[PDB]
Write a protein that binds this ligand. Structure first.
Ligand SMILES: Nc1ncnc2c1ncn2[C@@H]1O[C@H](COP(=O)(O)OP(=O)(O)OP(=O)(O)O)[C@@H](O)[C@H]1O
Ligand SMILES: NC1Cc2ccccc2C1
Length: 483
């Protein structure tokens, strides 16, 4: 029967330079939710893309030996290579230079023009800037926007960022300057060609133009709109929670269910900034330490709901202590003992024979429950720390049971077998819960454990502890799961 749809977007990034781990956080965060939602059985569409118009791109191609589009084709090639390297599961990549997007920018602008929502005037702002500009009279939608906030109190996440937008910006909404005559690289206004559509309407409509809105084929739009989550950093929350819902109202379209804004990755001299220069290249981190380590650090160290500071030391600690030592060596210790004592034949689960087992089994279920809650509220660092509490417990379980003492007594084979059974089932739980986060390690762990039944790699298989009630042969050549 038809799966419920879940549409998740990242912001479209500005290719005026190389992307850094700030951009990678948003795209990996989106990828984790997408993979998670697919595992829950949703019909997922995950969109990312590039904002390719503006004076900046013009300058960056002019201050180089190329046309805007040959420059942009180069940068986007590099961005798609990065997402490919990060194993981002985006279902589409929207570019604002492609016809499906530009068509929507022209028609949306002309529609608001014809409705009278956009009118011609002059912008006067701050050096002194003064030029003819089309204005979007958003002020008129103020009352309707506050009613939407009243009916959708969970619209902005986390809730901190909401009361700010309302307290600070909504004073009164001033008419938004939505066009300029001062540059030419962008979508020109059909009814006034010397006008070029500014960032607001151009960038925001990517979420709907990518679903074929106002085209011959609107089937993706009717299927996936409205968006379940727009992801972003805090600096553009007001554009997505004020300008975007008002634009959607003016076009008489359903509004998005949720905007999730995370915090900034900091690097000593403030926010990691493409422009500033204080930049960490995800490619260098993936090349040196591998994909799982780079994905894990991004999602674990930098909590959704606050800012995070990157240090090379903290990266090395997360990689070496959490991944290699805590998880990597739990599996190597377990497989080594199954080989040494049972010659690779893992005895079948029976029940909680040990007195530690009953509450540890209960801990396995309470980990899954705690994980689910954290993931639904987008608390990734808490979801992962909860998983690692369980991994740490599993390591402790080896110490508490002392399997090598049980191996001496020939009458303690039932209990030794039961200890090995609980070790592997604990590892299975951890492997399944990490599938949205780590693309390589879970696969490798199932491989070396010789778990081939694909049902046992899915969330539904965590409902009842002890699914392996058949003898299984684990690898006789265990190797490091990481890097
Ligand atoms: N330091 C950062 N921390 C977290 N997310 C970031 C960071 N920098 C960029 N992002 C992500 O990328 C988006 C910003 O996109 P953009 O292409 O404008 O890059 P930028 O670094 O903000 O640009 P610039 O440095 O020129 O202001 C954010 O909304 C967020 O999704
Ligand atoms: N942020 C940039 C995106 C965009 C699109 C069109 C015109 C200018 C700009 C500025």
């Amino acid at each position: 029967s038809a799966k419920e749809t879940f549409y998740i977007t990242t912001p479209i990034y500005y290719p005026s330079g190389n992307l850094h781990i700030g951009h990678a956080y948003s795209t990996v965060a989106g990828d984790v939710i997408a993979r998670y939602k697919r595992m829950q059985g949703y019909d997922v569409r995950y969109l990312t893309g590039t904002d390719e118009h503006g004076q900046k791109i013009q300058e960056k191609a002019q201050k180089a030996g190329k046309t805007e589009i040959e420059y942009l084709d180069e940068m986007i090639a590099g961005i798609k290579q990065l997402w490919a390297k990060l194993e981002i599961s985006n279902d589409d990549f929207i570019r604002t230079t492609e016809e499906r997007h530009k068509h929507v920018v022209e028609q949306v602008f002309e529609r608001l023009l014809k409705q009278g929502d956009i009118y011609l005037g002059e912008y006067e702002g701050w050096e002194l800037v003064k030029e003819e500009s089309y204005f979007f009279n958003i002020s008129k939608y103020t009352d309707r926007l506050l009613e939407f906030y009243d009916q959708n109190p969970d619209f902005i996440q986390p809730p901190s960022r909401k009361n700010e937008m309302i307290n600070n910006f909504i004073p009164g909404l001033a008419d938004l300057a939505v066009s300029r005559t001062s540059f030419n690289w962008g979508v020109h206004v059909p009814s006034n060609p010397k006008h070029v559509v500014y960032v607001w309407i151009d960038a925001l409509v990517n979420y709907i133009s990518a679903l074929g809105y106002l085209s011959d084929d609107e089937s993706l739009f009717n299927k996936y709109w409205p968006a379940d989550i727009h992801l972003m950093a805090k600096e553009i929350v007001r554009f997505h929670s004020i300008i975007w819902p008002i634009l959607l109202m003016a076009l008489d379209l359903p509004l998005p269910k949720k905007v999730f804004a995370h915090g900034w990755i900091l690097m000593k001299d403030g926010k990691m900034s493409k422009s500033k220069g204080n930049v960490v290249d995800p490619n260098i981190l993936i090349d040196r330490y591998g994909l799982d380590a780079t994905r894990y650090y991004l999602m674990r160290e930098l909590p959704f709901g606050s800012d995070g500071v990157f240090t090379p030391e903290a990266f090395v600690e997360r990689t070496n202590f959490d991944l290699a030592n805590d998880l990597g060596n739990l599996v190597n210790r377990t497989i080594s003992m199954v080989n040494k004592y049972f010659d690779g034949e893992l005895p079948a689960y029976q029940g909680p024979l040990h007195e530690l087992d009953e509450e540890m089994e209960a801990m396995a279920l309470e980990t899954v429950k705690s994980y689910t809650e954290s993931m639904e509220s987008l608390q990734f660092s808490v979801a992962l720390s909860t998983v690692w509490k369980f991994i740490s417990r599993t390591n402790k379980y080896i110490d508490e049971t002392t399997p090598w003492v049980l191996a001496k007594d020939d009458s303690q084979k039932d209990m030794l077998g039961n200890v090995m059974a609980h070790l592997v089932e604990n590892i299975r739980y951890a492997a399944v819960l990490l599938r949205p986060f780590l693309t390589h390690a879970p696969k490798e762990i199932f491989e070396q454990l010789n778990i081939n039944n694909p049902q046992f790699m899915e969330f539904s298989s965590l409902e009842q502890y002890g699914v392996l009630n058949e003898s299984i042969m684990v690898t006789g050549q265990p190797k490091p799961i990481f890097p």
